[PDB]
Design a protein around this motif. Structure first.
Motif, mmCIF file in Angstrom:
data_model
loop_
_atom_site.group_PDB
_atom_site.id
_atom_site.type_symbol
_atom_site.label_atom_id
_atom_site.label_comp_id
_atom_site.label_asym_id
_atom_site.label_seq_id
_atom_site.Cartn_x
_atom_site.Cartn_y
_atom_site.Cartn_z
ATOM 1 N N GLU A 81 -7.314 4.144 11.168
ATOM 2 C CA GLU A 81 -6.693 5.311 10.566
ATOM 3 C C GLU A 81 -7.701 6.170 9.816
ATOM 4 O OE1 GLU A 81 -4.813 2.696 6.809
ATOM 5 O OE2 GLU A 81 -3.653 4.279 7.777
ATOM 6 N N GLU B 43 0.817 -1.209 0.000
ATOM 7 C CA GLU B 43 0.000 0.000 0.000
ATOM 8 C C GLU B 43 0.856 1.267 0.000
ATOM 9 O OE1 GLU B 43 -1.664 1.809 3.130
ATOM 10 O OE2 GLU B 43 -3.632 2.329 2.315
ATOM 11 N N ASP B 44 0.828 2.034 1.086
ATOM 12 C CA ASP B 44 1.303 3.413 1.011
ATOM 13 C C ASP B 44 2.818 3.628 0.882
ATOM 14 O OD1 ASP B 44 -1.182 4.531 0.777
ATOM 15 O OD2 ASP B 44 -1.101 5.663 2.673
ATOM 16 N N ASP C 25 -2.374 9.199 8.237
ATOM 17 C CA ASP C 25 -3.642 8.951 7.538
ATOM 18 C C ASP C 25 -4.820 9.456 8.348
ATOM 19 O OD1 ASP C 25 -3.822 7.957 4.947
ATOM 20 O OD2 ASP C 25 -3.152 5.956 5.538
ATOM 21 N N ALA D 212 0.726 8.632 3.232
ATOM 22 C CA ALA D 212 -0.151 9.392 4.124
ATOM 23 C C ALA D 212 0.380 10.803 4.442
ATOM 24 C CB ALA D 212 -0.417 8.618 5.413
ATOM 25 N N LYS E 4 -7.176 1.750 5.671
ATOM 26 C CA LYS E 4 -8.142 2.738 5.194
ATOM 27 C C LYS E 4 -9.617 2.315 5.157
ATOM 28 C CE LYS E 4 -4.838 5.467 2.366
ATOM 29 N NZ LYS E 4 -3.586 4.919 2.997
ATOM 30 N N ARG F 184 0.530 -6.085 3.923
ATOM 31 C CA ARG F 184 -0.503 -5.056 3.894
ATOM 32 C C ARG F 184 -1.046 -4.920 2.485
ATOM 33 N NH1 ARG F 184 -0.074 1.177 6.220
ATOM 34 N NH2 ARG F 184 1.560 1.378 4.649
HETATM 35 MG MG LIG Z 1 -2.052 4.686 6.542
#
Ligand SMILES: [Mg+2]
Ligand SMILES: O=C(O)[C@H](O)Cc1c[nH]c2ccccc12
Length: 717
Positions: free
Chosen positions: A424, A272-273, A452, A625, A389, A329
């Motif tokens: 988050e 993810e991020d 986030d 984020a 999220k 994740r």
């Molecule tokens: Mg996050």
């Protein structure tokens, strides 16, 4: 692209081939039935995925309108809370319950310790993180500012003995504090032996044992002249390496070479991020690394470590795992990705794909690795997926149903796929008990953040008025309450001894003294894990778990309600005329540099996390984020007349050459200045701010992904 037809789907060939040739073999899953499963799961779950996204938008529109029709400066909490309940944002609190999640490994249920998060697209970093289960304390002390570089003790090109001695003394004090001697101090030790299953420490004038002999866990070499001694404290291992004929050992009173700490107990391999992955090629790079990790054959040759062999105090033999236990994740519910499109050309939801593909791939970590023997990951048979999220319990329930359907496709037992719930988003925060309940048989953690959650905080109340500065946010009442409430909810759900209660990332990678001073707050607050940016930081954060008895802390917190709904809902509005003009410009510059510094690497190089110099040249390692908070903050200040669009432009123009300069160490870097509107990265940065107010929940992915694809496409000149 080309594509492979499977029912209603058209799958990018690179992904189709990766799965057939690399992911499926060894799992005993019929390839035709897998692909049919993908088509069916995608067909069945897509409408509800979309419905959930639409519900977010409807709730946000009603909240925007609530603020816009009011003029009463201090928000009336009683009316505000009533409204949130009416629109279905704040749901009833369910009855007390205890989670039932089973088949979880000891690393998660029981052990308190650091948790590393690393971009899965970077094989070298992923390998290092997996190997970070054990880490050198001497290296971590010598290498960072935990031992200040005062006069005489600075790092040179070669070994500084004054500094080394400071390292040794720091570690002796740690040992005294963590595994106390019955009499005297490790500082005066002259040697170690094992006699009748007992550890004996020679002092100058006498010998002594441990004040708690049970902290003696084992050794290596001859009991009468051991090569190392293994200790255990609060469930974490400490190994004293003994070698008088080493660089450091020769200068040591007991011949001690190093102190190795069990450090990154678990590691989150991130899709993810912290990564930039915008198409089938990017996703396959990530999936392939995840595959190599689970099969144990990932090599970049840097390879995965074997388990560690020890002799038990009594003389028997045993092993300890040499690898960090891995989570993955997945991305959340929002984005689609053109790795698969339907017959209409519509992109398929990426979260759904991640569940199927990372889930399939994780099967390999449940079986013997052809390389070093034993299976790489979960011995108890779980697949650990962090799901980011989410907003509210219906979105948690959807994720669980997704996992349930994937398990069916993969022929896995129900509830094999465990969920790490990220707290988050505000609508999760205020309905947290309900979210945990919806995953009561799957949940293996909850965790909190700064970035986030703060981004969501700003966007949700975007229409209420100007928000406090970014740096101010981390100490606002809403966030302190959010942190405590997360712990309270987890402990009340019976997490102690069953699941992780986790806290956020230390982002200042070079400021380790500050980390060691500060981050102790988290296990003191009852967190059984918290996030670190590097193996080095994992080793240093481990110190905290030796000082703090997290299990006792959690026991003490039992039954306490330390945050109210009103505190949680306290919007971080700025007070009337809170800033001077110089402070306003500072905050604008801060955020524009933050956005530009991150976006340039993301858009131009597909890097989603790295050590990035801030406006004051402090090295920060932040994931995506950071973009969500900065762009939302600026959008909010632009929305409420704190700054003008010319202020934003001038700041972007001021900060861009500074970012260019901060990237001089990079062969591949392409300056944004002075042809600003010729840089796709610069335009991306601008677009994030100016369109921020209109992005769903302030998410940056729709703009970021588009711009990165734009860059990629024009690179294919
Ligand atoms: Mg996050
Ligand atoms: O919410 C927050 O505080 C951040 O999103 C967490 C975070 C900061 N740096 C990182 C590097 C890798 C992976 C996650 C992170």
């Amino acid at each position: 692209t080309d594509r492979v037809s499977v029912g209603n789907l058209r799958i990018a060939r690179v992904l189709y081939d990766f799965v057939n040739n690399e992911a499926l073999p060894g799992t005993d899953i019929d390839p035709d039935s897998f692909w049919a499963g993908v088509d069916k799961v995608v067909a069945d779950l897509t409408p509800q995925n979309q419905a959930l996204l639409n519900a977010r938008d409807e709730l946000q529109a009603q909240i925007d309108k609530w603020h816009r029709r009011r003029v009463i400066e201090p928000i009336d909490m009683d009316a505000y809370r009533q409204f949130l309940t009416e629109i279905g944002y704040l749901l009833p609190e369910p009855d007390d319950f205890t989670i039932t999640t089973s088949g979880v490994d000891a690393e998660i249920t029981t052990t308190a310790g650091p948790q590393l998060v690393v971009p899965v697209l970077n094989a070298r970093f992923a390998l290092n993180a997996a190997n970070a289960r054990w880490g050198s304390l001497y290296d971590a002390l010598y290498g960072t500012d935990v031992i200040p570089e005062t006069d005489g003790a600075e790092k040179g090109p070669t070994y500084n003995k004054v500094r080394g001695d400071k390292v040794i003394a720091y570690a002796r004090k740690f040992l005294d504090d963590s595994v106390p001697l019955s009499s005297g101090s490790f500082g005066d030790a002259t040697g170690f032996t094992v006699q009748d299953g007992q550890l004996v420490v020679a002092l100058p004038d006498k010998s002594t044992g441990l004040a708690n002999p049970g902290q003696f866990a084992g050794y290596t070499g001859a009991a009468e002249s051991p090569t190392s001694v293994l200790l255990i404290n609060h469930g974490l291992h400490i190994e004293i390496l003994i070698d008088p004929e080493s660089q450091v050992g020769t200068t040591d009173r007991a011949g001690v070479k190093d102190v190795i700490l069990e450090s990154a107990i678990t590691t989150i391999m991130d899709f993810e991020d912290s990564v930039a992955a915008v198409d089938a090629a990017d996703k396959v790079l990530g999936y392939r690394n995840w595959l190599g990790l689970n099969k144990g054959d990932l090599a970049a040759l840097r390879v995965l470590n074997r388990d560690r062999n020890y002799t038990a105090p009594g003389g028997g033999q045993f092993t300890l795992p040499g690898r960090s236990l891995m989570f993955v994740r997945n991305v959340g519910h929002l984005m689609t990705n053109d790795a698969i499109v339907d017959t209409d050309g519509s992109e398929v939801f990426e979260g759904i794909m991640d569940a199927l593909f990372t889930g399939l791939i994780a099967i390999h970590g449940l079986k013997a690795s052809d390389v070093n023997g034993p299976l790489i990951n979960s011995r108890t048979g779980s697949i650990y997926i962090v799901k980011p999220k989410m907003h509210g319990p219906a979105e948690v329930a959807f994720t669980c149903e997704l996992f349930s359907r994937v398990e069916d496709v993969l022929g896995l037992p129900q509830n094999t796929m465990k969920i790490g719930i990220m707290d988050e988003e505000r609508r999760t925060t205020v309905n947290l008990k309900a979210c945990i309940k919806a995953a009561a048989d799957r949940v293996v953690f909850i965790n909190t953040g700064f970035l986030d959650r703060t981004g969501d905080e700003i966007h949700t109340s975007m229409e209420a008025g100007p928000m406090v500065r970014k740096g101010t946010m981390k100490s606002q009442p809403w966030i302190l309450a959010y942190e405590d409430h997360n712990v309270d909810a987890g402990l009340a759900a019976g997490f102690s001894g069953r699941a992780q209660v986790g806290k956020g990332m230390w982002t200042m990678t070079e400021l380790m003294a500050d980390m060691v001073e500060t981050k102790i707050a988290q296990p003191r607050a009852g967190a059984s894990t918290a996030w670190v940016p590097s193996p080095t930081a994992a080793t240093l954060h481990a110190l905290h778990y030796h000082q703090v008895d997290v299990a006792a802390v959690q026991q003490g917190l039992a039954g306490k309600r330390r945050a109210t709904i009103e505190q949680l809902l306290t919007i971080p509005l700025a007070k009337e005329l809170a800033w001077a003009p110089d402070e306003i410009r500072e905050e604008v510059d801060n955020n524009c540099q933050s956005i530009l510094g991150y976006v340039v690497r993301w858009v131009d190089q597909g890097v989603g996390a790295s050590k990035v110099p801030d406006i004051h040249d402090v090295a920060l390692m932040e994931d995506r984020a950071t973009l969500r908070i900065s762009s939302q903050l600026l959008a909010n200040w632009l929305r409420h007349g704190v700054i003008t669009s010319a202020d934003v432009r001038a700041s972007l123009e001021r900060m861009a050459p500074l970012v260019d300069r901060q990237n001089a160490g990079d062969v591949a870097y392409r300056p944004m200045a002075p042809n600003f509107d010729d840089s796709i990265a610069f335009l991306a940065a601008q677009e994030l701010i100016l369109s921020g107010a209109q992005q769903p929940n302030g998410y940056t992915e729709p703009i970021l992904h588009r711009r990165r694809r734009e860059f990629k496409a024009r690179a294919a000149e």
